Amino acid sequence: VTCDVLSFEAKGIAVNHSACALHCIALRKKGGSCQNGVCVCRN
């Protein structure tokens, strides 16, 4: 749900994606990572 690096052909289609990532980024970050199913923000 968060540690999903795999991607598929979904241009404009509702598909499960790492929300925590884009969240922290757009919030006050740039990069994103996961650890043992745990959301981790990075530069």
Curated annotation (Swiss-Prot):
Note: The nonamer peptide CopA3 exhibits potent antibacterial activities (MIC=4-8 ug/mL) against both E.coli and S.aureus. This peptide (LLCIALRKK-NH2) is shorter than the mature peptide, amidated and with a Leu at position 60 instead of a His residue.
Main location: secreted
Protein name per Swiss-Prot or TrEMBL: Defensin coprisin
Domains: entry comment: Has the structural arrangement of an alpha-helix connected to antiparallel beta-sheets by disulfide bonds (CS-alpha/beta). The alpha-helix is amphipathic.
This protein's GO CC annotations: extracellular space; membrane; other organism cell membrane
Alphabetically ordered keywords of this record: Antibiotic, Antimicrobial, Cleavage on pair of basic residues, Defensin, Disulfide bond, Fungicide, Immunity, Innate immunity, Membrane, Pharmaceutical, Secreted, Signal, Target cell membrane, Target membrane
GO biological process, one term: innate immune response
Disulfides per UniProt: C3-C34, C20-C39, C24-C41
Protein family (similarity comment): Belongs to the invertebrate defensin family. Type 1 subfamily.
Keyword Signal: yes
Signals that turn on the gene: Up-regulated from 4 hours after E.coli bacteria injection and higher expression level is reached at 16 hours.
Organism this protein belongs to: Copris tripartitus (Dung beetle)
Subcellular location: Secreted; Target cell membrane
Known function: Potent broad-spectrum antibacterial peptide against both Gram-positive (B.subtilis, S.epidermidis, and S.aureus) and Gram-negative bacteria (E.coli, S.typhimurium, and P.aeruginosa). Is also active against all antibiotic-resistant bacterial strains tested. Induces apoptosis in C.albicans, but does not disrupt the fungal plasma membrane at all. Acts by permeabilizing the bacterial cell membrane, but not human membranes. Also shows potent anti-inflammatory activities, since it reduces both LPS-induced nitric oxide release and pro-inflammatory cytokine production.
Residues shown, of full length: 38 to 80 of 80
